[PDB]
Swiss-Prot record, chains A, B, C, D:
This is Capsid protein VP2. It is found in: Virion; Host cytoplasm. Homotrimer. A central divalent metal stabilizes the VP2 trimer. Interacts with host ITGA4/ITGB1. It comes from the Viruses. The chain holds residues 8 to 440 of 1012 of the full protein. A divalent metal cation binds at residue 23.
Length: 428, 428, 428, 428
C-alpha cells in the first residue's frame, strides 16, 4: 500500500467518499455520495427483518418488514437514498456502499442475525431469524447473534465489474390530458425473463354457481422492484355453450399482501370448437410498485349466462406466459440481497439505520448544464490490487456483514497510512 | 510514448486508420475505415443545425436540419457512411471517429457553434445556435463562433469501453409473398425503456359532434433512430351507450413533422359497466424511420353511433404504456450527441462534411468466406495509456469539438514520433 | 510536521488554544479564547434544531430552537460566548472554533443529524431533521443519525483568509436624556444588500371597509443578526379622493414570530393626480433584534375618510426598496451556517453544548491601557501547510461536523508529536 | 516552468479553462468557465465601440455601441455570459478572461484600435477611435490599427488579488402582490461613493411662466452598471409666497440617452422664512438599468400658484447629495475598462466577439445540494511565479490588448511543455 488506493479506500470504507471504478468502462461521469438515514420503530413481537439490496444501482436501498404475532411479516416502508437520484441524473453506476443497523432508543435489547444471499428475495428458502444463518455456506457472508446495542455493519462487495451504466427511472419530457400521467425511461439493459407454462391442455371441470367458480391456475415466485411487463397468451377450448371467463393477474409482495392487481380479460365469451385467445399485454410502471414483488399468480373465473343446478362447466387451456422485469439481471438490481433480522428487541424502541452509497453518475439534460463530467482518475494497479484483495478475501476477513465493533477495528487496522503529504510544500 | 500506441493514434486521429480496442472484449474481428462525404446546401435563413451521433456503432453518422423563416427546423437528409455496413457485416463495434464541417463554395460566411451533449437528442433543453453553448458545463466539450471558412472538427471520445459487439440491422434470409417484405436482425443488446402512464382514471367529458371529438391524451419525448416497439394497454370505462373509439400513435421527428403514424385501434365500441381493453402491439421497423424520432403522442377520437345536439360523451381511462427502443441504452446508439450549428452563412453556399469512422467488424456468412478475422493485436499498456490520457484530458486540451485550425496544430504537436524503423534492415 | 504548526494545531483542535492567522493581514493584536457552555432543555416532541454560525467574528455562536407539536419551530435562546466581547474589545477576527453537542441527563436518547450549509439561514430549502442531509453535496460537511449520547462535534473550517478586522458592536462614548439610549459602532465592512422591487405600477382595488383593508405587498427572505437599515421609496397614484394609507414593515424570525415591527407611514393622505411619496428611513439597532431574522414583509392599510357601502378604493404603487444588513457579506457573519438537529430525545433531558472560540482581538481604549498587543508570531510555511491540508481535505477526512467519537480518534491520530523540548536545557 | 502552473496557464490563456487563484482567500468553491458569443452588426458609418469590463466579477462582460452620422454613439446591446450566473450561484470571484473581436462576414474591412483604461467608463477624456490611443501611457495596454479581419484579443490582467467573494445579483426568496416584484441580494462589499454639493446658498431668479421655469442644477459623471442609491437633502429658502417646486433626477447613459428617470419631489409648496427640506431617498435596482450609466443630473421646476406677467420667482438652495453605487469600488466591477473601437468596416458586415470567462463560484442553496465545493488545489510558488511574471510584464510582452496573430504566437512560444505524463503508468 503506497499511501492508499482511492478505490480500495472507498470499497472497504464507503463512508469515506466515492471513487471511480478502475475497470474498462470509460465514461465521462461525476462522483457523488448519498446518505441514508432511518429510525425504524419496533413492532409488538419485538422482531423484524430488513431487506437490503447492497448492489442496487440507484436510490432504492432496501425495505423494512415487521414480524407479527401470527408469524407473517408486514411491510413497513422502503429504505431509500437521501434524495431521489432519477430526479437529477439519468445514468448511474454503483461504486461502494455500507450501512449500519443498531438500536438507539429504549422505552439490553435483543440480538441480530444477518446474511448475504446470492440471489433475489423470492429465491430464499428460509427467511426466519434463525433460518437465515444457512442461506450461504460462506462464513464471511453471515454473522450471528450480535447485540443490537452494538450494531451490525453491512458492506457491499462487488458482483462483477465492467458493468454498463444503468439508466435510472428518470422522468422524460411529456405532456398529457391526465394529471396523473407518468413517463419515464427505465432500467432496461440486462433484463430478466421468467417463462411460465401455465397450462398444457389442462382440463377444467366444475358445476355451475351464481357468480362463477374461481380458481388459481398457477402461482410462481418472481422478483421485481422496478417496472416489469407480462406477455404471452392462453388458448381456451370448450364444448359447452355460453361460458364467460374472467382473468386477473396478481403481483404479491413479500408480506403476502397484494401489491398490484390487473384484470387481463373481463367478461370474455367462449365459442365452441374454436381456439379462444386470451392475450397478455401488461406493462407495470415503477411508481405502481409499492413494495418488492415476490410472487405472481393468475386467477380465472368461469361463469355461465344461463345456469341451472348441475350444468357442469368445462374448458381446456394451453399456453405460456413471459414475465420480463426490466433490468432484472443487471448484477445488483435484484441479485445480491443482504438480510438483517432482529429479535427480542423491546417494543417501541428505535432501530437506527445509517449508511452511505457512492455512485458514478451522469446528470440529466438540465443539470448537465452546470455539472462537469470527466473520465476516471487514472491509477494503474488499482484493479489488480482490488483483485488481489478480493482473492484473499477469506484470509483477510473481509465480510459483507460485520459486527460493528469488528468493522471499526478493521477501519483502523487498515488505512494505517494517511501521511498528509510528503515534502511537496518544501519541494521548491 | 514509444513510437506510438496504435489505439491512441487512432482515437486522437481517426483519419489515420483503425486499430483494435485494448479492452477485455476478445473477439475474432477485422478492422475497417469508412469515409463520410457530404455537400450540404444552405437554406434561405443561412442558418442550420447538424446533429451528430459520434458514438453510433454503425453507418448512421448524423442528420442535417435547416432553420426556416418561421423558426422551426426542417429535416434535410441523414448523414451516413460511404457504404451500408449491415449489407456486408453482422456485428460491429466503434473504435474512433472524426468529422470536419466547413464551407467550400460561395454564391466570409458566418460562424459555427458546437457542443457535445451527454444525452439523446430529445433530452436537449435548448437547440438554438446560442443556446447550445450551455448544454454542457465542460469547457472542452463546447466551442464558440468559429469561422465557417476555417471549420470545426468533431472528435469522438469514448463513453465506456468493454462494450459488446452490436448487431447491425443486417437482412436475414427470408422469402415472402410481399415484394416489400423486410426481415432483419436488429440491435437488441442494452435496450432503453420508456414507461408512460397515459392515464390513471382520467375523466373525459365532451358533447357530441359529427365525425367525433379528438383529443391528445399525452405527448412525451423519446428518442429512436432504429427499430422500436410499443407495448401496454389502456382500459376504458363508460356509462353512455354506443360510444366508438379511435386511437392513433404518432412518432414525431426533430423538425416536428410526423415520421410514423400507426392506428392502434380504429372503430372500437364500448360496453357499459365493463373493462374495455385497448392493447398496444406496435413494432416499428428500422426502414420506416426516415429521421430521428423526438417525441411520441397518442390521439383518441370519440364518436357516437346515434348522436343528437347535446348527448355528453364520457369515458374513464386507466393504463400504462411501455416504449422500448431496441439497443437504445447501448453507449453511443443514442447517448452522446454532438451538435454543430451554423448561422449567417450565405444562402446557396456549400457546407462540406468530411470524416472517417473506424470499426471492429464481423462479416456476414457470405463475406466471412473470404474475410479473415483475427484477435486484436496485443500490446500491454495501451489501455493504461488511454486511461492516463483521458484522465488528464482537460490539462491536455483534448476536445470533442475543435476549431479545425487548433486540431491541426494538435496533430503535429502530438504524433511527433514516426521514426520509420530503427536498424531492422541492418540488424542481420 | 516539525513539532506542530501553532495555527494548524488551533484550526483542527480549537480547544487547544488560539494562534495568529498566517495571512498578509498584519495587525498588532492579542489572542484570546472564549468558552461557550449551555444546558438546553428538550421540548415535548423530543426534537429540536441548533443553528450554529461557525465563522461569526464575535460572541454570537448560534441559536437554539425547539420543534413543536404543530410542526413549527420555537425560538429558545441565543447561544453566546462566555462574556460579551464588544464590552472589552473593538475589533475582532476569528481564528478557529469547535463545539460539541451531546446529551448529559435523562428523566438511550435519540439521534442527531448535522450539516454545514454554504449560505445564510433563510437560504435553506429544507430545515427538517431528514431534509438537512441534502443541504450540501459534500460528504464531509454532513453526518447522519449519530447517537446523542455519543455526541457530534462541529469544527469550523475557513471561508477565505486575509479578511479584515471586524468591528464588534462596541458601545461608543455618548450621553443622552433617555436612559434607554444605546450608541454603538457596528460591523460595517463588507455589507450585504437586498434590492426588493415591491411594485411596478401595481393596481390595487377593493371596496370600502370600516377600519381599512390590509394587504401584504411582498414578503422576501433576508438574513440579519446584527443591525441593518431599510431604504427606498414607494410612489402611490390614485383617482379616488380622501384615501389614507398605513404602512408597516415586519422583520420575521426563523420561528415565524415577529421580531421587529416598524411603522413606515401611519395616517398618510393621498392627493389625486400627483405622485405620493412614501420614504423608507428605517435603522434597526442590534439590541432590538432578539433572534435571527429570516424574512421581511410590508403591510399596507388603505382606509377612506368618508366611506359608504361600495366606494371601491384604488391606488397604483411603483418603487424599490434596499435592505442593507451591515457587515452581512463578511465571510462568517451570515454565510456559513451549521445546523445540528436532534430527535427522539427524551422529553426533559438535557442537551449539552460546549465549545471554545479563538479570536485575534484589539482592546477598547480603556483595556488597551493594560493589554499589550503585538504582531503575529512569524513562522513561514504555516499558511502553505494550511493550504496543503485544506487541499487534501477530503482524502484526510477533515470534516465540519463529526461524530465526537471519530473526532477524538482524529485528535490522537493527528498531533502525534508533542516532544516537550529537545536538548535546550542541556544545550549549554 | 515545471510542466505548467495551473493558474498561470489560466491567467495567460483563459480559453484553456479555470484554475483556483493562489491567494490567501481560502473558500470552499467550484471552478467554472462561461463562454460569450456575439455577432454584432455594423452601422451605417461603419464605425463602432465595444466597451469591455475585463475584471467584472459576474456575467456582465461589456456593452456595444455604434457610432452614428451625427457623431454620437448609440447603445446596441449588453455583452453577457452564456448564462446568467446569479440564477445559479450566489458568490463569485474572477480568475481570468480573454475575448476576441474580429470580422466574420462581408456584404478588407477596416481597422481596430484598443486600450485598457485604469478607470471607469465616465472617467475617460476621449473615446474616439483615435483618441483612445492616449488613454494610457503604458505601451502594452494599447494597440493600433489592427486589421479587423485579423482581429484583436483582449486579455484580462489582474488589478489586485486577495479580493473577497462578490455576491451576484441573485434573487432572494420572496412573495408579493405585484407580479413585477424583484428581490435580490446585490453586490455590496467595497461600495463607491460620490459626494455632490449641488448648491451652497445658490440664488435662483427668474420671471413667472405658465408651466414653470426648468433649470438643471448640476450634472456630474458617475458610473454604475448594477444597483445604486441616492441620498442627501437640499434645503430651500424663499421670500416669495406660493412657490411650488418639482425635482427630477436623471441617470444618463454613455450614448447620452436617459436610462432612468426618478421624480424626487413633485408639487412641493414653499413656506416663507423657513427651511424647506427636499429629501433624496432613491434606490435604483439592477434590472432597471438597461445600459451603463455615465452621468447624473438634477432638474428643478419652479412654478407659482397665482402668476401674472412679471412676478420674479426666487429661492435659495443649500445641500449635498451622496450617490452610492453598491460594490462600485470592488476592483473590476467598474475600475478597469478595455475599449475596442473599429472603423472603416463595411456597413452590414458582422463583427464577431468570442471569449471565455473563468470564475470561482459558490452555488445557491438549491444547486449547493448537488454541487460539491472544495478548497483550492495547493501548489506553492504559484503566486510567486505570478508575481514574477507580472513583474517582468513589459519585458515579456504580456499585453491586455493583442493583435490576435501575436497572441496566437504567444500561445505557442509559451506553454511549450505539455508532456502528457512522465513514467506514472510504468511506475509500478
Amino acid at each position: 500500500t503506497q499511501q492508499i488506493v482511492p478505490f480500495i479506500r472507498s470499497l472497504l470504507m464507503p463512508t469515506t467518499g466515492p471513487a471511480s471504478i478502475p475497470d474498462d468502462t470509460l465514461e465521462k461521469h461525476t462522483l457523488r455520495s448519498e446518505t441514508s438515514t432511518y429510525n425504524l420503530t419496533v413492532g409488538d413481537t419485538g422482531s423484524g427483518l430488513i431487506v437490503f439490496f447492497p448492489g442496487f444501482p440507484g436510490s432504492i436501498v432496501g425495505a423494512h418488514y415487521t414480524l407479527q404475532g401470527n408469524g407473517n411479516y408486514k411491510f413497513d416502508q422502503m429504505l431509500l437514498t437521501a434524495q431521489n437520484l432519477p430526479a437529477s441524473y439519468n445514468y448511474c453506476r454503483l461504486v461502494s456502499r455500507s450501512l449500519t443497523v443498531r438500536s438507539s432508543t429504549l422505552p439490553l435489547n435483543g440480538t441480530i442475525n444477518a446474511v448475504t444471499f446470492q440471489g433475489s428475495l423470492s429465491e430464499l428458502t428460509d427467511v426466519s431469524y434463525n433460518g437465515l444463518m444457512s442461506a450461504t455456506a460462506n462464513i464471511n457472508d453471515k454473522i450471528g447473534n450480535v447485540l443490537v446495542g452494538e450494531g451490525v455493519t453491512v458492506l457491499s462487495l462487488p458482483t462483477s465489474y465492467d458493468l454498463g451504466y444503468v439508466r435510472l427511472g428518470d422522468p422524460i419530457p411529456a405532456i398529457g390530458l391526465d394529471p396523473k400521467m407518468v413517463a419515464t425511461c427505465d432500467s432496461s439493459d440486462r433484463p430478466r425473463v421468467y417463462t411460465i407454462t401455465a397450462a398444457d391442455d389442462y382440463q377444467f371441470s366444475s358445476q355451475y354457481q351464481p357468480g362463477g367458480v374461481t380458481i388459481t391456475l398457477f402461482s410462481a415466485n418472481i422478483d421485481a422492484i422496478t417496472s416489469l411487463s407480462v406477455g404471452g397468451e392462453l388458448v381456451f377450448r370448450t364444448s359447452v355453450h355460453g361460458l364467460v371467463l374472467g382473468a386477473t393477474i396478481y403481483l404479491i409482495g413479500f408480506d403476502g399482501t397484494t401489491v398490484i392487481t390487473r384484470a387481463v380479460a373481463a367478461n370474455n365469451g367462449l365459442t365452441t370448437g374454436t381456439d379462444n385467445l386470451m392475450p397478455f399485454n401488461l406493462v407495470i410502471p415503477t411508481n405502481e410498485i409499492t413494495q418488492p414483488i415476490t410472487s405472481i399468480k393468475l386467477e380465472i373465473v368461469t361463469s355461465k349466462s344461463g345456469g341451472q343446478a348441475g350444468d357442469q362447466m368445462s374448458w381446456s387451456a394451453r399456453g405460456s406466459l413471459a414475465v420480463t422485469i426490466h433490468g432484472g439481471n443487471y448484477p445488483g438490481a435484484l441479485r445480491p440481497v443482504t438480510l438483517v433480522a432482529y429479535e427480542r428487541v423491546a417494543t417501541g424502541s428505535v432501530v437506527t439505520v445509517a449508511g452511505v452509497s457512492n455512485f458514478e453518475l451522469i446528470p440529466n439534460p438540465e443539470l448537465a448544464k452546470n455539472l462537469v463530467t470527466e473520465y476516471g482518475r487514472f491509477d494503474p494497479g488499482a484493479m489488480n490490487y482490488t483483485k488481489l484483495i478480493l482473492s484473499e478475501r477469506d484470509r483477510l476477513g473481509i465480510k459483507t456483514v460485520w459486527p460493528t465493533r469488528e468493522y471499526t477495528d478493521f477501519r483502523e487496522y487498515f488505512m494505517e497510512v494517511a501521511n498528509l503529504n510528503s515534502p511537496l510544500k518544501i519541494a521548491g
